[PDB]
Amino acid sequence: GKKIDFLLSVVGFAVDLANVWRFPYLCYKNGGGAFLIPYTLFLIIAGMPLFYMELALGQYNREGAATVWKICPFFKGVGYAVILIALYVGFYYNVIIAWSLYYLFSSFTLNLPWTDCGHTWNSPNCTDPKLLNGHTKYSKYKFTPAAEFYERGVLHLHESSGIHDIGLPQWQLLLCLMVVVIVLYFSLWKGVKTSGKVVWITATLPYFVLFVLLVHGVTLPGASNGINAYLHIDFYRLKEATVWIDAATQIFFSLGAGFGVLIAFASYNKFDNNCYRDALLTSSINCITSFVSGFAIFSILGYMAHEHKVNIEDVATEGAGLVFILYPEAISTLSGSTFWAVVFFVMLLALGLDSSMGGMEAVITGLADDFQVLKRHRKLFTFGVTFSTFLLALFCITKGGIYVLTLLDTFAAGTSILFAVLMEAIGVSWFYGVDRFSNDIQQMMGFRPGLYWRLCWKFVSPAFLLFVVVVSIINFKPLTYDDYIFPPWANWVGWGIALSSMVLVPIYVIYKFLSTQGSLWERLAYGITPENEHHLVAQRDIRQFQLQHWLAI
Ligand SMILES: C[C@H](NC(C)(C)C)C(=O)c1cccc(Cl)c1
Ligand SMILES: [Cl-]
């Protein structure tokens, strides 16, 4: 049964709320395969090596995201940056989980609220395909019963004029978020241990849901056109860099790299655990799952396009909520729709709780390895972190909360996470030493990494990461939500949010340089040498001050 534990771990870590909620709308907004080509390319080239590197670092050093930088003290700033990114991304993940909980609560009925309009939340402009024969010519529709429900009875978005009029928190999403927060705190207040029990059903269910989605949606009146549009590549779309930026960000979202979660999780792994097999299996399963999810999503929205007599590009929204408009629509066409709705939204709740727990545990471990006081008081520290997250998510459940959620989803971990991962790779590979990293991996697992891994770690991955980071800055599209154009100050606030975590690296480098005592060269030596080898500095034996270290692969 040794292989069973391994397989369970890899399947559980290979599926995330990212793959199930963020990948659908990114794939739909970016062509639908013109997004997969960059996705697969980046997956291999950058995601596999960086996932492997993070796992190996966490395993060997036995430290969290922040404290693992005792190998190179100058990058504790990068550690703090990834911790802050994980904290930022934890303000709207809980809001998404609250939406899932609300949908699950609404699913306990024999007449689902998203099947037709005629309720209190339905506008006069609703069009029901079943109650009638069947437009702005470029809009995102918004007049379907499912979209009407999502945007009026759940978000109450019709009571906000923009991000400048967010309003007051909704008292229903308020209770949902309170329940989610309480569950997270009570699942994180005792310790890191949560595996080897009920996590069995939080990893198998997503695959069953995806499988049933495929088998059913393949046989739909309009799924053929959706599949055809999915399998058509538009290279003029590939010549824009928006798809490339989205692919990189979604990759680092789904694989978990750049959030400090992998390092913290691996810090508890057995010293002789195989990170290479972990990386290979997780990446392969992630790629296959992403392809299948794209196929199912495009089949469903092709069916919608056939049902609403609307072009495929206008059936559904291109932002957060695409899954909440899609899955109800597909469920309404299944026999016994109530059971399937319950199962689907229970799966969404389980996945979201698992992901939120992972991120919160990453933050807590990163900040607790640094300070012993917080380690001795896990309960109070967890309560404080959870309360802060609860308030900053309260900010995102207002009437105009979708605008804030879009701003965060766009700016919290975009160029910021790309820069953090680039700095991690540069730090390790160049300053600490790819040769030293390979020696550590050999000491741990028994075999030295191949040439492909070393080349990707040292040259290729940093190069493409830097290219994407530069392109995402020189080619920045002002934020928008469907047909709503954010005001310029919203863009300024988003860029400030990104910089808040991007600037911790140079600030910490400056702080470390000033704090250390000695001359310039001595300060540099203490700054780039591992903490446990500071005795060599007095002997004037620094490897980084030799060309052999820099010209070694
Ligand atoms: C991407 C991450 N999940 C892993 C690392 C892939 C397991 C996640 O969903 C997350 C990241 C930061 C904060 C919060 Cl709340 C959630
Ligand atoms: Cl993904």
Curated annotation (Swiss-Prot):
Its main location: membrane. One of its GO terms (biological process) is neurotransmitter transport. Residues 30-33, 108-169, 219-242, 299-338, 401, 482-484 are extracellular. The gene is SLC6A2. Na(+) 1 binds at residues 12, 15, 354-355. Changing residue 374 to A: Decreased homodimerization and norepinephrine transport. It is linked to Orthostatic intolerance: An autosomal dominant disorder characterized by lightheadedness, palpitations, fatigue, blurred vision and tachycardia following postural change from a supine to an upright position, in the absence of hypotension. A syncope with transient cognitive impairment and dyspnea may also occur. Plasma norepinephrine concentration is abnormally high. (R)-noradrenaline 1 binds at residues 16, 86, 90, 253. It is found in: Cell membrane; Cell projection, Axon; Synapse, Synaptosome. Disulfide bonds join 117-126. The chain crosses the membrane at residues 4-29, 34-57, 77-107, 170-190, 194-218, 243-268, 275-298, 339-364, 380-400, 402-428, 459-481, 485-505. It is a multi-pass membrane protein. PANTHER family: SODIUM-DEPENDENT NORADRENALINE TRANSPORTER, SODIUM/CHLORIDE DEPENDENT TRANSPORTER. Changing residue 359 to A: Loss of norepinephrine binding. Abolishes norepinephrine uptake. Na(+) 2 binds at residues 14, 19, 254, 286. It comes from Homo sapiens. Mediates sodium- and chloride-dependent transport of norepinephrine (also known as noradrenaline), the primary signaling neurotransmitter in the autonomic sympathetic nervous system. Is responsible for norepinephrine re-uptake and clearance from the synaptic cleft, thus playing a crucial role in norepinephrine inactivation and homeostasis. Can also mediate sodium- and chloride-dependent transport of dopamine. The keyword Cytoplasm does not apply. Changing residue 356 to A: No effect on norepinephrine binding. Decreased norepinephrine uptake. It catalyses: (R)-noradrenaline(out) + chloride(out) + Na(+)(out) = (R)-noradrenaline(in) + chloride(in) + Na(+)(in); dopamine(out) + chloride(out) + Na(+)(out) = dopamine(in) + chloride(in) + Na(+)(in); dopamine(out) + chloride(out) + 2 Na(+)(out) = dopamine(in) + chloride(in) + 2 Na(+)(in). This protein is the target of psychomotor stimulants such as amphetamines or cocaine. This is Sodium-dependent noradrenaline transporter. Glycans are attached at residues 125, 133.
